[PDB]
Amino acid sequence: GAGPEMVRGQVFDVGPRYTNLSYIGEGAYGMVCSAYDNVNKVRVAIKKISPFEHQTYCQRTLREIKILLRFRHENIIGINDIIRAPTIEQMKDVYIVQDLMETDLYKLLKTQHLSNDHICYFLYQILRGLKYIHSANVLHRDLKPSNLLLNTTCDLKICDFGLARVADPDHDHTGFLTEYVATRWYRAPEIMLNSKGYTKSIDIWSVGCILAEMLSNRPIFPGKHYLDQLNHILGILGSPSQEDLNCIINLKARNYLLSLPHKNKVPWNRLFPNADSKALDLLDKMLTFNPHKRIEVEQALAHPYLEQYYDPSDEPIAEAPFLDDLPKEKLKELIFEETARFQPG
Numbered sequence: 416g417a418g419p420e421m422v423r424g425q426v427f428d429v430g431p432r433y434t435n436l437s438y439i440g441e442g443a444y445g446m447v448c449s450a451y452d453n454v455n456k457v458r459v460a461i462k463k464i465s466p467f468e469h470q471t472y473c474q475r476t477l478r479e480i481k482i483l484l485r486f487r488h489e490n491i492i493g494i495n496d497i498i499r500a501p502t503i504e505q506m507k508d509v510y511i512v513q514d515l516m517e518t519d520l521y522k523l524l525k526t527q528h529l530s531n532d533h534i535c536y537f538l539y540q541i542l543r544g545l546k547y548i549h550s551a552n553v554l555h556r557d558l559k560p561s562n563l564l565l566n567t568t569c570d571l572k573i574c575d576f577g578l579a580r581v582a583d584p585d586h587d588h589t590g591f592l593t594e595y596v597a598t599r600w601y602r603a604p605e606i607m608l609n610s611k612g613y614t615k616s617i618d619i620w621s622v623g624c625i626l627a628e629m630l631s632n633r634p635i636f637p638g639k640h641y642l643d644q645l646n647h648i649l650g651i652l653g654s655p656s657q658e659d660l661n662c663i664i665n666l667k668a669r670n671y672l673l674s675l676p677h678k679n680k681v682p683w684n685r686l687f688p689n690a691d692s693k694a695l696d697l698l699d700k701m702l703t704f705n706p707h708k709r710i711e712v713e714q715a716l717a718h719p720y721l722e723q724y725y726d727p728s729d730e731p732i733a734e735a736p737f738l739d740d741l742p743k744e745k746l747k748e749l750i751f752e753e754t755a756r757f758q759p760g
């Protein structure tokens with residue numbers, strides 16, 4: 416006879432399939448552990464989610480689950496199993512079981528110099544995974560080093576689809592300084608000026624920032640607050656061109672930009688003196704101020720920097736491309752419904 420597993424004062428109720436737990440860290444809405452899987456005879460990662468009291472937590476849990484269960488791709492984390500109570504009434508927590516990865520790119524960048532061959536391979540795998548995501552008409556919207564998982568042979572998987580959305584470019588426009596959720600350092604400049612982050616170009620900017628960070632082990636645009644992020648971006652890209660300003664029709668955003676003293680572009684080869692010149696050409700194209708001129712994922716894959724890996728026949732797309740007002744009680748039923756396939760029976 417035996418009760419639920421405990422780890423650091425919290426119930427971590429995954430057994431009897433999952434045993435031999437070790438703490439990893441804190442996730443979004445709960446604890447992250449590794450565990451031995453007695454069926455497949457491997458250690459696995461498990462995240463405990465407790466979203467049911469809040470509609471926003473519910474929405475994000477459901478999004479992640481629905482997207483990750485639909486998606487199947489070598490460069491996208493899957494869901495192996497989901498543990499929850501057998502009834503809606505007894506269900507307080509949801510545990511998501513995923514492949515156990517050695518590390519993530521955030522941790523790796525804090526401790527390891529990357530060879531040019533490693534940067535190339537990591538960038539390739541990011542864009543290969545992103546090709547799939549974008550082909551499903553989905554935007555990840557929070558791409559950053561801690562959302563890129565790596566195994567001991569440097570295979571890379573994109574994780575955390577909690578902020579993802581279906582692309583909606585005809586409703587992308589908004590006013591100046593409109594609040595935004597995704598991680599500050601990886602936000603494209605247009606977020607602060609006139610964009611809701613509903614186009615694919617939002618994700619390309621983030622990947623551009625990740626590439627820059629792989630080159631120097633330091634975030635390229637480490638802003639400390641909302642409009643400081645734009646200060647950092649303009650400080651390297653320089654003042655936007657007249658043509659690029661003309662595409663910002665909103666007057667508050669345009670006039671803000673016009674009010675600033677002239678800033679020169681900082682050449683990439685001066686910021687990154689050891690970088691491969693083809694890597695810097697692709698970086699320039701991913702960190703293009705004007706999101707209409709920014710390179711797309713499939714163009715990025717075809718760039719000469721990635722020529723050793725590029726193979727469109729081995730860069731699959733989604734077979735089946737793809738909640739704001741639904742309250743938390745209905746979202747519980749949808750989460751209960753979406754996780755039913757993992758139950759006994």
Ligand SMILES: Clc1cnc(NC2CCOCC2)nc1
Pocket residue numbers: 439460492513514515516517518519522564574
């Ligand atoms: Cl879904 C998932 C989450 N984390 C891991 N692993 C950790 C190991 C410690 O470094 C950070 C990543 N694997 C899978």
